[PDB]
């Protein structure tokens, strides 16, 4: 079949600054006969439904802000937006009309900007949960930036991957920022076998690694 | 324009059937043509297959093969998809998409089909609180975790919604056929451990509403 | 094609007078003759009278003699209906209907006359709860009354509109001439009592609004 | 005068089928030379004004659809519908404009099918009652079918028969079912003079009264 590729897959881009998006597809889309070039351009709001914005490539369609503007022949396609608003945080999507099936992009989230610093806070297990028959140990990361990070866990000096599991929401309108939750799981008898509990994140901003700590007794 | 007018969420199980009816309005229905889209672990759009209701010509992709049919009625001008031998990747939205001309494409509100072998129960509330006495920073955190409940989404409150300020709710993780969701909030040093808060969650489907204190 | 137009209710007392006014538009009202009809207990109706317009032609029932007098305005083009010696049996929804031809007629939407020896009073509400500590059912059923207001009507919600489903609404009935109401609503026992509900009543002539948590 | 009569007072019907309604003068309403006969039927929906249906008996209303008609001269009045609506819920009347005083018709009503029954709506007084010197027992009926039903009280095994408020609502837009609300008022120092409190009902369709009761200590 025919592939398409869509690079970057994401963009951080302020107030006021232009955008411009790649969909690459795996040969010429264009068409001899009506000289029209066939692809669409969709943008999925969070929590809504994705909608047609710029159709053949070359119009925009009735209703379309004039801030979209479609333009790229042949192999290359390039999307511009003149200005971006406060309303244009979404998902694109690149679609394909020339061939059966129809291909669908991989898409492209927008982000906001900028410079979050993080923060750990660790929480010891409760008291219904050693009496239900296990425990958790888990540490949460709020307030940072990019969404790019890692999380370790290491268990009495030892590192163990086994009931790792992450937790990651959207972007907080309210400080432009994420938040993360990490969650380990473990049963009440390796929680008496064992002591200290640590885990350990990365962040591209920090030199070290912000390491926290609590004990059993 | 058109009013496209879906079914609700459906919760079936692995094995079975499952029907999804899309109701177009304002325009002839044998005229335009129908599709339909899958959207894939949230930020991936899949294509289903399309119909011509004039001709009822019926074609697929590759991966959808011997899967989902494609009927539709004339009377009504509606369009069924039916589903068989359902696994569990088959949980995703669907869309209705209905092509009328090439400027825009007119597109549904979208179906949410949850397919697990899961029993409804009530959930459970484990509260969090720091083990520290003592801390530099000026603003504490605390945690609320809601385990063992089923099914998705549960409204989680803090102090019956009186504090809207520095609330993070995580979204569920599946667990062996259990959803599990965290959520934390940020309070300064000045009520804690001054005042006492609790953690209030709601669960629809189960009515069973259950509050604990930190 | 016409327009019917009337006063609203009004709050009379014992012993006065009451003018009822019938609006018309669209039509010469030196023409077709107006009639009145008297509607008791909800459903059956009752022949008031007519009269007309350019001839002073009036004819009354055997039973508004002495009581209903018709009184027509040609500058003005409207109706006119005045009563003398009000009592308890003479609050009824009131309608005018214009006489056209023998086939169809025109229709009002009605004025709403009460008449009573009254005093408005904030409406005094109380809690109620079953008293058994166990039961068979599954639902939990729970109600308020209302009781000492006046004048109609009353909104009577639950949770602040919250919960639209199970709720019923029954009428008031007069007793020591005022009104009193009740409603009830299902609630499941996996809430009850371990959350609380409120009754919010609502009084717009008093502008009282007061809440019980049960 | 002359005075008409309508039978039956109610029927239950359903989805589909037909309806006739009867109205029956005591006196001849035709008129020799026109062969026409004086009536009219009237259609009046809950909060909105009454409307006409068939006039002269013989004929439709312009803008009325074609399922209303009606046959019939002289002493007995036919009104017929081929196929009821959801919309079709209203209370019918008929009048002759014979003769003066003009006379008017019962009123039918139709109503929906079928088998709704409740079982204990028993509230015991509150604590608040007994604050302003009175005091009220209620009982209530939800989900029932048909509309007509007997209430009694019983105190200490005695009937009472004042102090009685009954109450009853229309027919539900869901369930299509009824809702009977009991009031039984009283005095502040006869409450505390009975203890056992007994509501009975009789309904239709079980061939034995339900009966429930409570104790004040």
Same mark, same amino acid.
């Given at each position: 079949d025919?592939?398409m590729?869509?690079?970057? *897959?994401?963009?951080?881009? @302020?107030?006021?600054?232009r955008?411009?998006?790649?969909?690459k @597809? *795996?040969?010429?889309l264009?068409?001899?006969?009506?000289?029209?070039?066939?692809?669409?351009?969709?943008?999925?709001?969070?929590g809504?439904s994705?909608?047609?914005l710029?159709?053949?490539?070359?119009?925009?369609?009735?209703?379309?802000?004039?801030?979209?503007?479609?333009?790229? /022949?042949?192999?290359?396609? &390039?999307?511009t937006?003149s *200005?971006?608003?406060?309303?244009?945080?979404?998902? !694109?999507y690149?679609?394909?009309?020339?061939?059966?099936?129809? +291909?669908?992009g991989?898409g492209?989230?927008?982000?906001?900007?900028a410079? #979050?610093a993080?923060?750990?806070?660790?929480?010891?297990? @409760?008291?219904?949960?050693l009496?239900? =028959?296990?425990?958790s140990?888990?540490?949460?990361?709020?307030?940072?930036?990019?969404?790019?990070?890692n999380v370790?866990?290491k268990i009495?000096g030892?590192?163990?991957?086994?009931?790792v599991?992450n937790?990651?929401?959207?972007?907080?309108?309210?400080?432009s920022?994420?938040?993360?939750?990490?969650?380990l799981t473990?049963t009440k008898?390796?929680?008496?076998?064992?002591?200290?509990? &640590?885990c350990?994140?990365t962040?591209?901003?920090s030199?070290?690694?912000?390491?926290?700590?609590?004990?059993?007794? | 324009? $058109?009013?496209?007018?879906?079914?609700?969420?459906?919760? $079936?199980?692995?094995?079975? /059937?499952?029907?999804?009816?899309?109701?177009?309005?304002?325009?002839?229905?044998?005229?335009?043509?129908?599709?339909?889209?899958?959207?894939?672990?949230?930020?991936?759009?899949?294509?289903?297959?399309?119909?011509?209701?004039?001709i009822?010509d019926? %074609?697929?992709?590759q991966?959808?093969?011997?899967?989902a049919?494609?009927?539709?009625?004339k009377?009504?001008?509606?369009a069924?998809?039916?589903?068989?031998?359902?696994?569990f990747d088959?949980?995703?939205v669907? !869309?209705?998409?209905r092509?009328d001309?090439?400027?825009?494409?007119?597109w549904?509100?979208? +179906?949410?089909?949850? $397919?697990?072998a899961a029993?409804?129960?009530?959930?459970?509330?484990?509260?969090l609180?720091?083990?520290? #006495?003592?801390? %530099?920073? @000026?603003?504490?955190?605390?945690?609320?975790? $809601?385990?063992?409940?089923?099914?998705?989404p549960?409204?989680?409150?803090?102090?019956?919604?009186?504090l809207?300020? =520095?609330?993070?709710?995580?979204?569920?993780?599946?667990?062996?056929?259990?959803?599990?969701?965290?959520?934390?909030? &940020?309070?300064?040093?000045?009520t804690?451990p001054?005042? +006492?808060?609790t953690?209030?969650?709601?669960?629809?489907?189960?009515?069973t509403?259950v509050?604990?204190?930190?």
């Open positions: 025919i592939v590729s869509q690079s970057p *897959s994401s963009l951080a881009v @302020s107030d006021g600054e955008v411009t998006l790649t969909c @597809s *795996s040969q010429s264009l068409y001899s006969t009506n000289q029209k070039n066939y692809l669409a351009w969709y943008q999925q709001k969070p809504q994705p909608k047609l710029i159709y053949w490539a070359s119009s925009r369609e009735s209703g379309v802000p004039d801030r979209f503007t479609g333009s790229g /022949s042949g192999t290359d396609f &390039t999307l937006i *200005s971006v608003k406060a309303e244009d945080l979404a998902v !694109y690149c679609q394909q009309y020339y061939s059966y099936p129809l +291909t669908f991989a492209t989230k927008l982000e906001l900007r410079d #979050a993080p923060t750990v806070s660790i929480f010891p297990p @409760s008291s219904e949960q009496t239900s =028959g296990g425990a140990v888990v540490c949460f990361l709020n307030n940072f930036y990019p969404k790019d990070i370790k866990w009495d030892s590192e163990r991957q086994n009931g599991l937790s990651w929401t959207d972007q907080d309108s309210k400080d920022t994420y938040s993360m939750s990490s969650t473990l008898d390796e929680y008496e076998r064992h002591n200290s509990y &640590t350990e994140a962040h591209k901003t030199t070290s690694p912000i390491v926290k700590s609590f004990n059993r007794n | 324009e $058109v009013q496209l007018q879906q079914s609700g969420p459906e919760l $079936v199980k692995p094995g079975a /059937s499952v029907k999804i009816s899309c109701k177009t309005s304002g325009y002839t229905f044998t005229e335009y043509t129908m599709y339909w889209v899958k959207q894939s672990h949230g930020q991936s759009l899949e294509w289903i297959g399309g119909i011509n209701p004039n009822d019926t %074609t697929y992709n991966n959808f093969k011997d899967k049919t494609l009927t539709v009625d009377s009504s001008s509606t069924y998809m039916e589903f068989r031998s359902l696994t088959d949980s995703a669907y !869309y209705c998409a092509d001309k090439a400027s825009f494409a007119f549904g509100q979208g +179906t949410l089909v949850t $397919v697990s029993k409804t129960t009530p959930p459970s509330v484990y509260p609180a720091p083990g520290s #006495a003592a801390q %530099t920073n @000026s603003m504490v955190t605390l945690g609320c975790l $809601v385990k063992g409940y089923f099914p998705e549960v409204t989680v409150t803090w102090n019956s919604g009186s809207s300020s =520095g609330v993070h709710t995580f979204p569920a993780v599946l667990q062996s056929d259990l959803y599990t969701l965290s959520s934390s909030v &940020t309070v300064p040093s000045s804690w001054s005042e +006492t808060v953690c209030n969650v709601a669960h629809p489907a189960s009515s509403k509050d604990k204190k930190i």
